[PDB]
């Protein structure tokens, strides 16, 4: 159907890969899983219904 | 040109076909049809050995393969041995039959009788075989084929949902949904239900420190507490069924049966 | 024919070997030293006569008018290519490792030879599969321990030819064979690792081999930790190079279909998610209409504990996820979402207390909701997304004071 086996160019130098450039590049993977807080309608409304539970259940 | 048989002898035993087929020994469909009814009587009347019905059914299957009959009768014979085989624990011949049924449904000339029933078997057998790609490749076949009447059939939805429920250890709904299964689906689950119960039991025992023996009994559909304790004895956990007396806040004096699931952790991590 | 005499290869030989690309009007396609009395020499002199014929049959192949049937024509080439590669196999059995990449050039253009045929009912890939299988075994057991001729440097390049074949019609056992055979071979040191194999001389195959491996591990065997590892490495060895005509990554195509599996596999195993503005992540996700919207909301649903947004994201692209072999990954990633939300009623609803009522989680028949909730938490405890224990009596979960909500890193 669609072939990704046909690479446009067969080889390149090692210094051109992304891991050899990963000294000068930043980690592509954010590692803040434990402490990242996101702001969106959902997080806000979740805190809302949760601080309402601690008022109901002091 | 297809081979066509003249044998008017209803019965035939199964032998792996090695030579060029003998048309005097192969039965035409009208005789295969006449023997289907005899076999069906014996089955409904419970007067034949499963070994006997299975031999007769394989001989009927062999005679259809070499006569190249792919019609509504072929589908019936394979569908009936599939069902009977599951009723007798013959998962090997079920799988032989289930595969042939699915390839016969690829034939547009052959109408899909009970297509959704055997889609349900295909999913349950892939759960037994821990073959999740097959499950996903089949849902995808139903989607690409346009089979939305099948996919939003409540029973069919539940059976795919069961596959997922087992993938993530949801014993609470997997065991509730055991009661929603048809006669031969139950037969198929039972081929691995013991181990699944054990897998569920390990999850409970890793996650509580003690639970009522009634709570285990209900969540695992044990119809009596006697069938609950014998299941634990099969796992060498009978000694972890302690007795504790309960004040019930001065409501009543009573004693209940606890299971020390923390002590069971020691014993169940040895087997897996 | 000094390539075969003095054991080297140039572009012209590979250019001669390339039967699909027509050569110029000036022609240098010949074998010298024609005396072929030696039985092994007319192998080289019919290898010649088959090489001339196939390149001739490729201007022949499109020059035709509408005739309607080219079956014999495609079967003339497949058979010529089958017995020519079958005879390159005979020659390369007994020569140094100079000749392995010319053997691989020959093998991958025979895969494209059968690929253009759209019908699979002919099952004409069995010939080349067996051909490539012996071609993969020519190098697999080189019993000359000297590395001047050892063909086990080209082991992994030949594994990717067979992976491509074992995917044409879905076969997941044949893929399972070759991952496991190869695994022991450098654990036993019978072959050198992929970083010291011939693969790093043509690094398309270095990225591809880590795809097939990571993909098999992630989508077929359900070993997510190792399917991530190999897929991640396949992206990390892709070039930081771009086509100038468009300015998007050379290898944009390959890079994105790795990341279809890499992003969800990264979140399940290691709890890792991309830096969206990062050149490589941004370069691929933003330019892929498929991934531009689903994957960013997919990540947000998990990080934030948004079960509805996860379940809607997954229900809306179910066909995509099923087609990409991602169903178990998604189905298991959903329980990461559920545990993050559990972490969020701890941080914001219990003030980080180890004992937490279960009715907090209902605020997002009631006996039944609580039984189901006990069981879904129990399953997460048991597989190591929560270090806690449950009380059915108090209907509460008792988080460990030490390292609850753990995760691999």
Curated annotation (Swiss-Prot), chain A:
GO terms for biological process: double-strand break repair via homologous recombination; filamentous growth; maintenance of DNA trinucleotide repeats; mRNA export from nucleus; positive regulation of transcription by RNA polymerase II; proteasome assembly; proteasome-mediated ubiquitin-dependent protein catabolic process; regulation of cell cycle. Keywords: Acetylation, Phosphoprotein, Proteasome, Transcription. Signal peptide: none annotated. GO terms for molecular function: molecular adaptor activity; protein folding chaperone. Disruption phenotype: Impairs mRNA export and transcription elongation, and induces strong transcription-associated hyperrecombination phenotypes. Coiled coil: none annotated. GO terms for cellular component: cytosol; proteasome complex; proteasome regulatory particle, lid subcomplex; proteasome storage granule; transcription export complex 2. Present with 5590 molecules/cell in log phase SD medium. Part of the 26S proteasome. Associates with the nuclear pore complex (NPC)-associated TREX-2 complex and the COP9 signalosome. Interacts with CSN12 and THP3. Versatile protein that might stabilize multiple protein complexes involved in diverse pathways. Subunit of the 26S proteasome which plays a role in ubiquitin-dependent proteolysis. Also associates with the TREX-2 complex that is required for transcription-coupled mRNA export, and the COP9 signalosome, which is involved in deneddylation. Belongs to the DSS1/SEM1 family. This is 26S proteasome complex subunit SEM1. It comes from Saccharomyces cerevisiae (strain ATCC 204508 / S288c) (Baker's yeast). The gene is SEM1. The chain holds residues 32 to 89 of 89 of the full protein.
Curated annotation (Swiss-Prot), chain B:
GO terms for biological process: mRNA splicing, via spliceosome. The keyword Transcription applies. Keywords: Acetylation, Nucleus, Transcription, Transcription regulation. Its main location: nucleus. Transmembrane segments: none annotated. One of its GO terms (cellular component) is nucleus. Residues 90-264 form the PCI domain. It is found in: Nucleus. The keyword RNA-binding does not apply. Interacts with CSN12 and SEM1. Belongs to the THP3 family. Forms a complex with CSN12 that is recruited to transcribed genes and required for transcription elongation. May also be involved in pre-mRNA splicing. Present with 3360 molecules/cell in log phase SD medium. This is Protein THP3. The lineage of its organism: Eukaryota, Fungi, Dikarya, Ascomycota, Saccharomycotina. The chain holds residues 187 to 458 of 470 of the full protein.
UniProtKB/Swiss-Prot annotation, chain C:
InterPro entries: Csn12-like, PCI_dom, WH-like_DNA-bd_sf. This is Cop9 signalosome complex subunit 12. Component of the COP9 signalosome (CSN) complex that acts as an regulator of the ubiquitin (Ubl) conjugation pathway by mediating the deneddylation of the cullin subunit of SCF-type E3 ubiquitin-protein ligase complexes. The CSN complex is involved in the regulation of the mating pheromone response. CSN12 forms a complex with THP3 that is recruited to transcribed genes and required for transcription elongation. GO terms for molecular function: double-stranded DNA binding; RNA binding. Its main location: cytoplasm. It is found in: Cytoplasm; Nucleus. GO terms for cellular component: COP9 signalosome; cytoplasm; euchromatin; nucleus. The keyword Ligase does not apply. Gene3D superfamilies: Winged helix-like DNA-binding domain superfamily/Winged helix DNA-binding domain. Present with 1510 molecules/cell in log phase SD medium. It comes from the Eukaryota. The keyword Cell wall biogenesis/degradation does not apply. The lineage of its organism: Eukaryota, Fungi, Dikarya, Ascomycota, Saccharomycotina. Keywords: Cytoplasm, Nucleus, Signalosome, Transcription.
């Amino acid at each position: 159907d669609d072939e990704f086996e046909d690479f446009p160019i067969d080889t390149w130098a090692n210094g051109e890969t992304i891991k050899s450039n990963a000294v000068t590049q930043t980690n592509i993977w954010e590692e803040n899983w434990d402490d990242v807080e996101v702001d969106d309608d959902f997080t806000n409304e979740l805190k809302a219904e949760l601080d309402r539970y601690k008022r109901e259940n002091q | 040109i297809h081979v066509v048989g003249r044998c008017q002898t209803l019965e035939k035993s199964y032998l792996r076909l090695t030579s060029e087929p003998n048309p005097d020994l192969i039965r035409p469909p009208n005789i295969l049809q006449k023997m289907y009814c005899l076999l069906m009587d014996k089955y409904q009347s419970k007067t034949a050995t499963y070994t006997y019905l299975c031999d007769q059914f394989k001989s009927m299957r062999q005679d259809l393969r070499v006569q190249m009959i792919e019609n509504s009768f072929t589908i019936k014979v394979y569908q009936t041995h599939a069902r009977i085989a599951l009723e007798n624990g013959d998962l090997g011949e079920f799988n032989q039959c289930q595969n042939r049924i699915m390839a016969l449904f690829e034939n547009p000339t052959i109408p899909k009788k009970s297509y959704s029933e055997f889609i349900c078997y295909s999913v349950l057998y892939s759960m037994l075989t821990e073959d999740y790609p097959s499950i996903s490749h089949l849902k995808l076949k139903l989607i690409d084929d346009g089979s939305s009447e099948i996919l939003e059939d409540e029973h069919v939805k539940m059976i795919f949902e069961l596959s997922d429920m087992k993938l993530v250890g949801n014993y609470h709904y997997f065991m509730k949904n055991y009661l929603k299964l048809h006669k031969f689906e139950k037969c198929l689950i039972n081929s691995f239900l013991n181990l699944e119960k054990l897998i569920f039991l390990t999850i409970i025992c890793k996650s509580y420190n003690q639970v009522n023996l009634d709570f285990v009994k209900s969540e695992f559909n044990f119809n009596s507490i006697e069938e609950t304790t014998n299941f634990l004895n099969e796992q060498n956990l009978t000694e972890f069924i302690l007795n504790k007396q309960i004040t019930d806040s001065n409501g009543k004096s009573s004693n209940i049966k606890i299971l020390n699931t923390k002590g069971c952790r020691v014993q169940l991590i040895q087997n897996y | 024919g000094c390539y075969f005499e003095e054991k080297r290869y140039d572009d012209k030989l590979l250019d001669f070997i390339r039967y699909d690309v027509k050569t110029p009007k000036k022609t240098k396609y010949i074998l010298q030293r024609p005396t072929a009395t030696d039985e092994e020499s007319v192998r080289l002199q019919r290898f010649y006569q088959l090489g001339v014929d196939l390149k001739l049959k490729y201007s022949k192949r499109r020059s035709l008018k509408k005739q309607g049937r080219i079956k014999n024509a495609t079967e003339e080439l497949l058979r010529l290519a089958n017995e020519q590669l079958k005879l390159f196999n005979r020659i390369v059995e007994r020569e140094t490792n100079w000749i392995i990449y010319p053997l691989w050039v020959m093998a991958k253009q025979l895969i494209r030879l059968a690929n253009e045929s759209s019908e699979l009912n002919k099952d004409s890939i069995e010939e080349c599969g067996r051909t490539i299988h012996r071609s993969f075994t020519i190098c697999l057991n080189d019993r000359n321990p000297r590395l001047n001729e050892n063909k086990k440097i080209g082991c992994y390049m030949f594994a990717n030819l067979e992976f491509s074949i074992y995917h044409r019609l879905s076969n997941k056992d044949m893929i399972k064979n070759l991952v496991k055979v190869l695994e022991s071979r450098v654990n036993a040191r019978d072959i050198p690792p992929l970083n010291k194999s011939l693969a790093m001389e043509h690094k398309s195959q270095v990225v591809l081999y880590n795809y097939y491996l990571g993909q098999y591990y992630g989508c077929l065997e359900n070993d997510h930790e190792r399917g991530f590892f190999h897929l991640n490495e396949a992206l990390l060895q892709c070039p930081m190079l771009y086509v100038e005509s468009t300015g998007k990554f050379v290898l944009q195509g390959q890079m994105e279909k790795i990341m279809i599996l890499l992003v969800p596999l990264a979140l399940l195993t290691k709890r890792l998610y991309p830096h969206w503005d990062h050149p490589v992540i941004a370069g691929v996700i933003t330019r892929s209409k498929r991934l531009s919207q689903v994957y960013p909301t997919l990540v947000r649903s998990v990080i934030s504990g948004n079960l509805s947004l996860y379940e809607a994201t997954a229900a809306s692209h179910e066909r995509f996820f099923l087609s990409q072999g991602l169903h178990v990954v998604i189905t298991l990633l959903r329980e990461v979402v559920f545990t993050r939300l559990v972490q969020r009623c701890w941080q914001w609803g219990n003030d980080r207390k180890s004992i937490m009522p279960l009715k907090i989680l209902l605020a997002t028949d009631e006996e039944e909701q609580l039984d189901a909730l006990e069981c879904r938490l129990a399953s997460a405890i048991a597989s190591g997304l929560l270090r806690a224990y449950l009380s059915h009596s108090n209907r509460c979960i008792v988080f460990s004071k030490k390292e609850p909500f753990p995760h691999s890193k």
